[PDB]
Symmetry: D3
Subunit: 300 residues, 6 copies
Amino acid sequence: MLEVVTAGEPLVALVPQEPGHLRGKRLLEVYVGGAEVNVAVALARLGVKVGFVGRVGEDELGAMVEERLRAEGVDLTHFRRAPGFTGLYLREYLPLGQGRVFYYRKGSAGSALAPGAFDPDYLEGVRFLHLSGITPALSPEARAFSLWAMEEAKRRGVRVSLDVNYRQTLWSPEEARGFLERALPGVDLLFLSEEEAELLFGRVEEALRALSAPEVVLKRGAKGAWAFVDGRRVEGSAFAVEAVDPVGAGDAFAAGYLAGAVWGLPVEERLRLANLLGASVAASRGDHEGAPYREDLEVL
Amino acid sequence: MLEVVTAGEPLVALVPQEPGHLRGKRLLEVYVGGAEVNVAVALARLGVKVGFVGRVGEDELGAMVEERLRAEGVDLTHFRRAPGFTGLYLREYLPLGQGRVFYYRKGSAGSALAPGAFDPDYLEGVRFLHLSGITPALSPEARAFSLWAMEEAKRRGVRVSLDVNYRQTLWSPEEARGFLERALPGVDLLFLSEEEAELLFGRVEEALRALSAPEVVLKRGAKGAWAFVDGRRVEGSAFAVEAVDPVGAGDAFAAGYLAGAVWGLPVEERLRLANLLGASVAASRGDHEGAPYREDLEVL
Amino acid sequence: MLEVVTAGEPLVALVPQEPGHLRGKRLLEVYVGGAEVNVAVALARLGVKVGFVGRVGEDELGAMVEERLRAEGVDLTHFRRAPGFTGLYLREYLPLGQGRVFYYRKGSAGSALAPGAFDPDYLEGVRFLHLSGITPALSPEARAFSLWAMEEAKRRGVRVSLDVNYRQTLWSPEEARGFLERALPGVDLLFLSEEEAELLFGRVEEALRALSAPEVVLKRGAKGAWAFVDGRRVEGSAFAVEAVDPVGAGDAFAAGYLAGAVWGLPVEERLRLANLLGASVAASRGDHEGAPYREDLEVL
Amino acid sequence: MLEVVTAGEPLVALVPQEPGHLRGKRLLEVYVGGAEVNVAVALARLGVKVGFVGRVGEDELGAMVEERLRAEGVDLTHFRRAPGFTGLYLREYLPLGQGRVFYYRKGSAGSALAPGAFDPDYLEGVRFLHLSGITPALSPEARAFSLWAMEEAKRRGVRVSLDVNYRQTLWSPEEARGFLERALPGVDLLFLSEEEAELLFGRVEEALRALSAPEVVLKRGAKGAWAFVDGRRVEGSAFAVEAVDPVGAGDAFAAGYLAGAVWGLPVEERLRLANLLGASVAASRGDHEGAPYREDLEVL
Amino acid sequence: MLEVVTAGEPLVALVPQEPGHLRGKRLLEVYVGGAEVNVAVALARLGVKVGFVGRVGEDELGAMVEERLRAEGVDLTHFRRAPGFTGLYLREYLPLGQGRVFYYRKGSAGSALAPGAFDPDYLEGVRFLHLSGITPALSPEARAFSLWAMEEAKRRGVRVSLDVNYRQTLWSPEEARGFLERALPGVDLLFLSEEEAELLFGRVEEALRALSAPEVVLKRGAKGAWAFVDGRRVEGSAFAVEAVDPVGAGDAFAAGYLAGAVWGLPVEERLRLANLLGASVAASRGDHEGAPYREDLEVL
Amino acid sequence: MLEVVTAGEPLVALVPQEPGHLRGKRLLEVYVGGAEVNVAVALARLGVKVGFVGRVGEDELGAMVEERLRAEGVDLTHFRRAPGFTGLYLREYLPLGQGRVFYYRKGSAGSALAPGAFDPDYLEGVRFLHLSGITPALSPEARAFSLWAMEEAKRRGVRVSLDVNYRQTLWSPEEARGFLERALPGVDLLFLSEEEAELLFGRVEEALRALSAPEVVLKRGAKGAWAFVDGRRVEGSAFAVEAVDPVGAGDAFAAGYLAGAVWGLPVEERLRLANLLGASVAASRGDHEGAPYREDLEVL
Ligand SMILES: Nc1ncnc2c1ncn2[C@@H]1O[C@H](COP(=O)(O)OP(=O)(O)OP(=O)(O)O)[C@@H](O)[C@H]1O
Ligand SMILES: Nc1ncnc2c1ncn2[C@@H]1O[C@H](COP(=O)(O)OP(=O)(O)OP(=O)(O)O)[C@@H](O)[C@H]1O
Ligand SMILES: Nc1ncnc2c1ncn2[C@@H]1O[C@H](COP(=O)(O)OP(=O)(O)OP(=O)(O)O)[C@@H](O)[C@H]1O
Ligand SMILES: Nc1ncnc2c1ncn2[C@@H]1O[C@H](COP(=O)(O)OP(=O)(O)OP(=O)(O)O)[C@@H](O)[C@H]1O
Ligand SMILES: Nc1ncnc2c1ncn2[C@@H]1O[C@H](COP(=O)(O)OP(=O)(O)OP(=O)(O)O)[C@@H](O)[C@H]1O
Ligand SMILES: Nc1ncnc2c1ncn2[C@@H]1O[C@H](COP(=O)(O)OP(=O)(O)OP(=O)(O)O)[C@@H](O)[C@H]1O
C-alpha cells in the first residue's frame, strides 16, 4: 500500500562539469530530472512507499528515466514509455552564480498528461498526492489533469500537497494566480518560496493571506523556512553548506517534509528533515543525486 | 571574393565517449554539426573562400556554433543568431556498428530558412553553391528557399552542387523524388550514395539514368566512389582506415571534391581529394572534427 | 509466471579504462558481474521472465547489485541483502591480449548458498533452471545446493541448464570431473567451451562422449559454436566483431540460447540468437553491459 | 643511517571522485594507503631518512604499493612482496559529511607480521620507531610483533612513537585498553585523538592520566592539538582549510611531529609542523597525496 | 573602428586538474594564456572592439592560440603565425596555496616583437593601448617595441594603459624601475599591485609618489583596490569568492577597468567592473576562462 | 654489479588521450620518455641490473623523471637533478596515422652531457654500454661525450651497443654518416631500422656493407627484424598486434635484445625477446609504459 503518489513530466538534465557559459563546454553530464521525479526518488530513498505517474518517449532517454525510477524502487504501476520523445534541458552555471536554462521539451510524451491518465483507485489509502505548479503550466490538458487529480484524491480522503514552483517560462503571473485561485481550495499542504510569493502577490505577506491553506511552508533559501500550521508559525534553519548545484533542492525540501508528515512527525522535525534533504541536494550536482537514504538519517 | 557558398540548418551533436546504448551513458561530447556546416568548415580549413548562410537560436548553443564558424574563418555575412532555439541531436553507436539518432530540432531558428533569406548579390562571382537534400526536407519554406537559392545562382552563372543526403526521418522516398525531379534541372554537380539511389530508384542503375546531371558522384562507402563526368566513368578508391565515427564523412567527401573543382583539378585529383577528407573525418569523432587543413595536403 | 530461474554469487567487477597492468592504473570502472547475474539480466532485457536467487552483503556494493537487478526487471523474490560482504574482483587486460583476474570474494555473503536457500515452489511452472560450474566450486554448501537445486527442478518438470564454466582458481580438473560425473544425470542442456573440454577430458572428442547430455552446446570462441541435439550436429557462426572486453560473453551466449529455447525456436535460431548476445557483450566493456534488448532483435 | 622506522600493513584505497553513496558510483580512484605507509611517505617527502617494514601480496596492487614506497624514497630493506594478496578497502563520503568504509583485507599478506618480521639490527642508531594501534589489532601475531618491535627498539635506545588509532572494526575498547595497558610502559611519544580517549576512558581527562607517557599529543581535530611534555601543556592551532578528504590526516599529523622531533625542534615548532601536514592531507584526496615536500616548508 | 589595442607574447598554459606537485600529475589541462591575451579576450567578451598584436609559432599551439582569439572575436589584423615556436609554461598549485611556474618560451616566435611590428595607422581613433611590464622584460627588441608603441599611440592621441606586472623571472627590480622611470612619462593609466610597489619602491607609499601617472590603480588582492584619479582616492571592494586558480585575475581586472573607461563610466563603476572580472577569473581555472560576457553584466 | 649502463637526455612526453590535431586537445597525458630512459626501464623491469647516466633540471618534471627511474629500480649513481630545466615534447597522432612531434628541449640540463659526465670505473665489469644516435646529435659536447663514453667502455672490455635512431630534427644525413663513420669502429652491436639505412645509405643493402659491425640488427617494423651475426642472417617475426602508440617501441626492442644477449641467449631467442618488447610498447600509450616485467616472460 503506497503512502505517497506524485505525477508530472520527467526530464533529462544536461549539465557541464564546471561553471561557465554553455557555448564553451565540450562535455556534458547526463542526469534524470523533473520536479515530481526528484521528489519521488527522494522519498523512495528514505523508505517511503511512493509511486510515480507519468509518460516518457519510446527513446533511449525515456528508457534511462525508467531505469532510474525502477532502480530507486519507485512504483511505476501507472508510468510507461509511450510514443513520442522524452524532454530534456541544458543548464548553465556562471562563475559568479547567475545561471540559465534551455529547454527542449515542448510536445514531449510527458507533457501529454490529461484527465484519467491513471486509475483513480490507485490513490486508495494513499497518504498524500504531490504535484508541482510546473505540471498545469505545460498544457491545457495538464492543467485539467492536475485539477482532476487533486479532486479524485480529496474524494478518497487523500491530502493534496502542492509546490507552487512558478516558472516564468511556462506561464504569466496572472495565469499562475488564476490557477492557484482555482486550485487552492483542494490543497492541504502548500510549498512556496519567497521570490514566488513576491513575484505573484507583491509581498510575502499578501501571498500568505491569499494562499491560506491548512499548512503552508515558506522556503527562505538558506534563511531556513517557516511552517504555518495551526495559526502557529514555526521556524526552521537551513544547514550551513556550500551550494554546488542548487537545482532540485526545493523538490528535495518538499520530499523531506512529506516524509516527516507521512511519519506523523512534529513540525519541528518535519522542517528539520526538509532542510536536511534540501541541503544535501544543494551541495551535490544533478537534479536529485544528493538525496540521502534512510540509513543516513538513522546514523545522523 | 568568395569561391563557395553553402546554406542550411546548423546543429549541435551530442555523442557518447564510446559505443553503447545512450541510456547507459553518463557523459556526452558536444560537437557542432550540420551537413552544410561540415562542408563549410572543411573547405575553409583547406583555404577555400567560403561563406555560410543560416540562422541559429539566441541561446548558448547557437553562440557556440557562431564561434566555431568564425574561428574556422567561414564568412558569416549572412549568418546570424535570431530569436528561437538552436537545434541539437543525440547520436548512439552500438558495439556491433548499428547506430541510432535522436533529434530535437523541430521548430528551430535554423529550420526557418525561406526565399530571400540572404542577399542574392552575395552569389556574385561565386564558383559553387552547395546545398543538401536535408534543407528542403525540413519545411515548405526551406524547400522553396532551396529552389529559390539555386535559381539565383544559375542566373548569376553559379554552378549548383547538391548532395542528395536523403533522410527517411524528414520525408518519404516519393517526396524526395518529387523534389529531385523538380530541382534536377538546375543542378550541375550531384552527390549521391549507393543506398540512397537504391532506396529511391530501386537500383543504382536507374537512379543514374533518371538523375543524369552534368557531373554525378556516386559514393560507394569504402569501395571508393565513381565520377561520371563527360560520359566518362572515373573510379576512385577510399583510403584504408578504421571507421571511428562515420558521421559527417559524406559532407567531408563533398567538400574535398568541391575544393578540387574550385581548384580546377582533374577528376582523378578531385576524387583523390574527396576520399581523403571523407576518410579523415570517418577516422575521427564529431561531425567534422577530422577535416584536414591545407598545410596537411601540402605535406602529404 | 517465471520462465527461467538462475542462481549463484553476484560480484562487482573493477576494470581499468584501457589495457595495461593494473599497478599502473589510477581509475577503475565499477561493474556488476557474476555469471548467472549476467545471464539473468541478458534474459530480462530480452523480455524473458526470469528470477535470480542469491545473496549479497549488507554493504554499498551489495546494494548496487540489488538496484541493477531490480532496475533490469529481474525477479528478486528469493534474492536479498544479508549480513556479510559483497564479493568483488579486479580485471586486467594487457596490450597483447593476455589478461589476469584478482578475487576478493572468499567468505562473502553470496558464497553461502546451501540447500534450501529458496522455496522450491518457486520453480513451479518454470521452463529452465540455469546454474554455472562456478557455484558448486565455491564451497561444500554451494556444491550441495547446486545438486539440491537441479533435483527439485527435475522433480517439478523443470529442465536443467548448466554452463560448465570451469575455474582453475576454484577447483582442480578432477574435482570438476567428479562433480560433472555426479551432476550430469540431471542436466538437460549443457554449455561447454573447447578449452574446458580439452582441459578436463584431454580432447573435445572424449568430453562430448563422456558428457553426453540431451543437448550439448560447444562454444568455439569466434569459430561459432556447435549444437548437438538429436544426434544431429548443427553448426553456428559467430558475428565478426572487434573483441573489446570478452568477459561475460559466454554467459551472454547461454542467455541467448535459453531465450531461443524458451521461445521454442529452431536450433538454427537458438544458435543465431546465442552468438548474437555473445558478440554484443564481447564488443563492450563490463560484465554484461553489451547485452541487447528485445527491441534490438525486433529491429534487426 | 635511518632516522625513523615504521611498520604495518599497507592498503590500497578505492575512493569515488565525489561525495555520494558508493552504490551509485561508476568510477573509483585508486590510492596507496595504510597508516604507517602514510607516515613513511610523509617523512620521506620532508627529507627524513625513513624505512618501512611490511609485506604485500604477490599481485598487481602489492606491486603498486612497492613502486610508490620506492618512488617516494622509503627504505624497503625489510619490505617485500610475499605470497598472498594485498588488502584493499572502499571509502564513501556522503553529501553531509558522514562517511563509511568497507574492508577487504582479512587474511592478507600484510596482516601476517609476527615477531622477527625483520632484522633488529635495522633499528640500530634509529631515532624513532613508529607504530599504529591498527597493527596489533589485526591479529595475535601482529599484536605480538608490535610488542616485540618496541622492545627491541627500547633495547637499542630507540624512542617508541605510538598513534593509538583505535579501530572499532578491529577490536573492542577493552581489548584496546588491555593492549595499551600492557604496551604503554615502552612508549615514549603517544598520539591520541579526543574521540579515542573519550571512547576508551570516558573523558579526555582520565585517558591523559591513565595513559601518562613522557610526551602525549592530543589531536583536537580543527581545534588544533595539545602537547603535554614536561608537565607543560603547549597548545597548537590547526590551519584554516576546507576539509576535502580527511582520511590520512592524523597519520600526516604524526609524521609532521616526528620530523620536528627528529630535527630537535621546539614543541611549538613540532606542533606547527604537525598541524601543517595534517591540514595539507586533509585538504586533498587520497590517503597521503597531500603530504608536502621539504622544499615547500623551505619556501613557506 | 577599434576601441582598444593590446600587444604581447601569447602563451599556452599547462595546468593540473587539482592541487599538488607537478611531478605527481599524469594529466594536464591546456589553456591559452598571455597577459595581454587575457585582456584582449576579456574585452571582446564584453563587446569592446579590441585588436591583438603579436606572433606565434607555425605549430599546433600557435594555431590553437589563433583559433581562440578569432573565436572570441578579437581583431587579428596584425596578429599572425610566423616561423618559430609558440611558448608555453606549466603551473603548479600546492595544497596550502604556494604555487610555482615553469616556463618554456625563451626564443619563441612571440618574444620577437620589435619596433614596427605593426602598422601605426592601426592605432588611429583607438581609445586605449594596453601593454604589460612582461613584454619589455622579454628582450631588448621587445623593450624597444613597447617604448615605440606607446610613442606612436601618444602621437595619435591614444591613451596609454600599463600594467606593471613585474616578473622577477624576466628582470631585476632595478631593470624594472629603469624601464618605468623611462616609460612613465607616456603612461596615462597605470595598474599596480601592492606587492609590486613594495618589491620595487620599498613601500606602497613611495611607489605611488614616484610613479605618479594621471590615473593609477592599486590592486590590493581581495582588499579590493584603490583608484587615484584627480588627487581623489576612490576605493573599491573585491567580491567575496573562493579563489580557485588566481592566475589571470589581474589581467581580467585591468580589462574590466578599461571597458569601464572606454564606456566613460564613473570611477566607482570602473572599479566595480574591474573587481567583477578579477573575481570571475579568480574563481575559475585557466588563464582567462572565467571572463564574463556582456550579457552577464546586463543580467546582473 | 651492473650488467648494462645507458646514458642520454631524459624527456617528458605530453600526449593527447586520442588521435587528432594537437590544437584541438584540451587535456594531455604526461609520460616520462627519452630513448635510453625507455631502454633503462625496460631492462630493469626484466630484472637486468642497469644504471642510467644523465641529468635533468631542478624542476618538477626533472623530479618526476627521477622518481620513475628510482621506482623502476634503475641505478642512478651517476644520475642527478642539476641546475637548468628538464626537456619536454608534445606528440600528435592523426586519424590516418601520420604523426608530428614538437620539442621544447634546446638548452636543457640533460643536453649538457660532456666527456667525464661520470666516473669511468662505473663501467667496470659491465656487460654492455648502450647509447642512441640522438645523444651525439644534441650538441658538440654530447657527441664528444658519446665518443668518449664508448672509448672508456672498450678499454674496460665493455661491449658497445648503439641504436642509430637518426633524427632529421637534430642533424643532417651527412652529419650522421660523419659520426657513424667515426664511431663505427668501437661499436659491437648496432641497431638500425630500414628507413634509416635507406635515408642515410640509399638502400638497406649499402648501409649494411658500410656499417658492418660484429652484430647488426635491422628492424623491419612489423616485418620482424633480421639479425646479422656470424655472416649468418637470422630472421625474426614481429607479434601480430594493433599499434596504439608506436613511440618508444624501437627502444623497447633494443632492450629485449640486450637482455637476451646479457643472458647469453641464442640469436633466435634474442630476436624473439626483442620483438616481444617492441610489440608490447607499441600496443600501449606512453614512451615505455607497455614494457613487460620478468614475471610476464616467466609465465608466457
Ligand atoms: N545552501 C543551502 N543550505 C541548506 N539548505 C538549502 C540550501 N540551498 C537550498 N536549501 C534548501 O532548499 C530550499 C530552498 O529551495 P529553493 O528556495 O531554492 O527552491 P529551489 O531549489 O530553487 O526549487 P528547485 O529545486 O526546483 O530549483 C530551502 O527552503 C532550503 O531548505
Ligand atoms: N572508412 C573509410 N575510409 C575511407 N573513406 C571513407 C570511409 N568511410 C567513409 N568514407 C568516405 O565517405 C564517403 C562515404 O560517405 P557515406 O557514403 O558513408 O555518406 P555518409 O558519410 O554516411 O553521409 P554523412 O556524412 O552525412 O553521414 C565515401 O565515398 C568515402 O570517400
Ligand atoms: N569476437 C566475438 N564475436 C562473436 N561472438 C563472440 C566473440 N567472442 C566471443 N563470442 C561468443 O561468446 C561465446 C564464447 O565465449 P567464450 O568461449 O569465450 O566463453 P567466455 O566468454 O570466456 O566465458 P565468460 O563469459 O564467463 O568469460 C562463443 O561461443 C561466441 O558465440
Ligand atoms: N581541516 C583541518 N585543518 C587543519 N588541520 C586539520 C584539519 N583536519 C584535520 N587536521 C589535522 O589532523 C589532525 C586530526 O586528525 P584526526 O583527529 O582527524 O585523526 P584522523 O585524521 O581521523 O586519523 P586518520 O588520518 O587515520 O583518519 C589534527 O590534530 C589536525 O592537526
Ligand atoms: N578572491 C578574489 N575575489 C575578488 N577579486 C579578486 C580575488 N582574487 C583576485 N581578485 C581581483 O584581482 C585583482 C588582483 O589581482 P592580483 O593582485 O592578484 O594580480 P594577479 O592576478 O596576481 O596578476 P595575474 O593575473 O597576472 O596573475 C584584484 O585587485 C581583485 O580585484
Ligand atoms: N605492431 C607491431 N607488432 C610487433 N612488433 C612491433 C610493432 N610495431 C613495432 N614493433 C617492434 O618495434 C621495432 C620497430 O621499431 P621501429 O622500427 O618502428 O623503430 P621506432 O619504434 O620507430 O623507434 P622509436 O621507438 O624510438 O620511436 C620492430 O623491429 C618491431 O620488433
